[PDB]
A paper describes a structure:
Bacteriophage T5, a representative member of the T5-like family of siphophages, serves as an excellent model for studying the assembly, infection, cell wall perforation, and DNA ejection mechanisms of this phage family. In this study, we used cryo-electron microscopy (cryo-EM) to determine the structures of mature T5 (a laboratory-adapted, fiberless T5 mutant) and urea-treated empty T5 (lacking the tip complex) at near-atomic resolutions. The T5 head comprises 775 copies of MCP gp8, arranged into 11 pentons and 120 hexons, forming an icosahedral shell with a triangle number (T) of 13. The T5 tail, which comprises 40 trimeric rings of the TTP and a distal tip complex, is connected to a unique five-fold vertex of the head by the connector complex.
Residue numbers in the entry:
A (entry chain E): 11 to 377
B (entry chain D): 11 to 202
C (entry chain D): 304 to 377
D (entry chain F): 203 to 377
E (entry chain G): 203 to 303
The structure:
């Protein structure tokens, strides 16, 4: 064992919540459209991916006696008797995204999801971790929980526990943008416009003064009125006024655009996916997004599951519609490989997502 | 079973409606061109897609005894004896889009649509969910309803129930734009 | 669209126990290019990976009850 | 922000002065109000004021952009990965990032491990999704090398991340 | 930064003067306030001031870019490697850097 695990325990006995503002998070998610779209895109893309259970690693694991078919059914078909696979995956992904850590409880035969807003992980003096405390009371144990953690740098030292959430980082930019937008709308609402100003040095009959104010305003409007010439008699003048505060000084386009780009950068969604563009803009950006953003996020979970069960579990899409390969190039390279002898026909059929055919010459290499 | 389902029930016993402004939603849908076009495009595109029933998974399900052909006819040809497949799909999709969740009641031999604006989902202390309350009265049960939920982050905790509607995010920018347009037209009208 | 329908199909699969997946294959806006489809289908059929009946099914035609269309040519 | 400034040389009834201030502000707003013409009687004037400090002098876009450029440079991530771009740009930048930034960093660790244990340890991705090679070019060069005789079939299968097949003619060079 | 300058030729009660300074500043901000019109009584005027030193005269982009380019030139790293570009920019620049430097 590690001789200095006690020191690391004393440095940070328990986990710390890293989602400092949950209510503001919920309000921004509920009333800001960029946040809603990006978060929904990330969660749906992560939940779309499937899982594959392969070889068995000869190591001692927390959960033993579990067959490959049971894992295949749990991860793919239906984890709980009472909950969907899509709902389970989306809940786990949103827990991981909004909160630094995510947890999945392991029952005798099924995987139950546990919210991460109430979990508090307690470190151990000797090995790694002593116990998990769901809010309070229950005190799960350790053998029954799968632990997924994002890399975090809290306070001074990096933590073996806890985890830092991507959505908190974005919370300031939305506030900064919303303040400016509300400022613009309130400036428009409270502004005043004046068309004509007349000045006199005498007290001219307030009532008929207001009557003349109405009369001139109606008459000189070119939409409803047919007057253009004004004759001022009695000494009345016209002050050549100007506009003090105009709406052209408020140039908020660049700042709002920068805040939007910063939000998209923080979540990791490429700009082209949100806007749309040419084919060369479309497909490589989809591949970049899916692979380089989602696949590490699922890789954390798959590594945790591999540690827990002892079976090689890797993310495998191979069905996602947005990752559908080009038909012509796929056919060309598969047929070339099959004809030249590198791969059998059955392997090509499997890669085409078809079913292997029980022939004789398709299980032997042609040349 | 989960040893801590009681705590999750205590946190969120019942569902919460996330369509805060329904009347403003309806008025904007009725009198805004971009909202109408985008919503119609999404709903029609979702309703265009068909469904395929394939292999049978050897698990114990809520509804058993249904053959492949009957399910295929229900999903594709004609769900109810009294309503269209296109109308059924469009209703389900618009319920899912405007309200966070959508529901489909399961009768003896056919699928009946139930609006999501009135149903309230009651969580269970032990397993997942106790009953669905259609406004009031009925208390359907659970075995008779298909539940579809969008991912939601309400208040502080993400709920296993409820769901967050995409159209409400818009009911802010639409008002901001309409105010500016009306300001422009009235400034033009009142000028001299 | 497809994730939106995927939630519904996953719920239906849980409810009924039948693998239900979204499948367009008929949507006019998703009509594939005729020439590229013909090229890749004919290459796959001739080289031996895919039988003729599978190609007809992917062309949204009906299977034809022949003898040499249910066996791999080469 | 100020819309209108009126000045007078006499003390005109503070309370009704404020009432007139709110009345004019409500009336002359084109959003809620239908007045455009104003008459000043009794000697009240209007000072043609201007704006001292505007929001157009605060041009901060370039400096903030430069700070972002410097941060991205300091860590080493090509900017196209963060922003996104065309077909040609999107793959070479991924390769440049991974190789130049990551691989030396893992190379330090692998050299230390080789010193510690005495086994040649080298970083090997060959599985990273973002480094997935082009299918057509890979097939072309592998098939050419296999057919011409430089590389056996088993080596090609291994490079394709498949499993070696226990045949006879795949462990001997064809020509 | 200054928004309004009002001038008077009399000693008008410093304390209430500061109170009015706070009141006008809070009232006339469109973020928190619903007033747009001001009336000056008693002889108080408004000086049309301007801005002496602005932030637009400080154009430092070109000089900083020149210094960064000079540093990169001194070490020998091509600018494209630091910024990133197209494939024809990526590979030849990598080869040039490695070889020549």
């Amino acid at each position: 064992l590690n001789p200095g695990q006690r020191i690391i325990r004393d440095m940070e006995p328990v986990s710390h919540r890293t989602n400092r503002k949950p209510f503001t998070t919920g309000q921004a998610y509920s009333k800001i459209e960029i946040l809603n779209r990006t978060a929904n895109m990330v969660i749906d893309s992560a939940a779309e991916c499937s899982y594959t259970v392969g070889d068995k690693y000869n190591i001692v694991t927390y959960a033993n006696g579990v067959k490959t078919k049971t894992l295949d059914t749990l991860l793919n078909v239906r984890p709980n008797p009472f909950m969907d696979i899509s709902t389970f995956r989306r809940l786990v992904v949103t827990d991981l995204l909004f909160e630094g850590c995510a947890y999945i409880y392991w029952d005798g035969t099924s995987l139950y999801h546990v919210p991460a807003a109430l979990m508090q992980v307690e470190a151990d003096a000797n090995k790694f971790i002593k116990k998990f405390i769901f809010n309070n009371q229950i005190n799960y144990r350790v053998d029954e929980i799968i632990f997924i953690k994002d890399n975090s740098y809290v306070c001074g030292t990096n933590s073996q526990i806890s985890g830092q959430s991507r959505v908190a980082t974005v919370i300031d930019s939305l506030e900064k943008r919303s303040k400016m937008l509300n400022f613009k709308e309130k400036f428009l609402d409270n502004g005043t416009v004046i068309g004509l100003i007349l000045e006199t040095d005498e007290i001219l009959n307030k009532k008929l003064r207001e009557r003349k104010q109405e009369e001139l305003q109606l008459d000189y409007n070119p939409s409803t009125g047919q007057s253009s010439v004004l004759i001022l008699d009695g000494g009345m003048k016209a002050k050549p006024y100007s506009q003090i505060s105009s709406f052209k000084d408020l140039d908020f386009k660049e700042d709002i655009e920068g805040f939007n780009k910063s939000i998209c950068l923080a979540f990791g969604v490429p700009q082209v996916l949100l806007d749309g563009g040419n084919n060369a803009n479309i497909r490589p950006n989809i591949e970049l997004f899916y692979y380089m953003t989602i696949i590490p996020m699922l890789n954390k979970l798959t590594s945790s599951l591999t540690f827990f069960f002892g079976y090689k579990i890797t993310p495998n899409t191979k069905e996602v519609a947005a990752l559908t390969p080009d038909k012509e190039a796929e056919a060309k390279h598969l047929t070339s490989l099959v004809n030249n002898g590198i791969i059998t026909g059955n392997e090509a059929r499997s890669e085409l997502n078809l079913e292997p055919l029980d022939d004789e010459q398709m299980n032997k290499i042609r040349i």
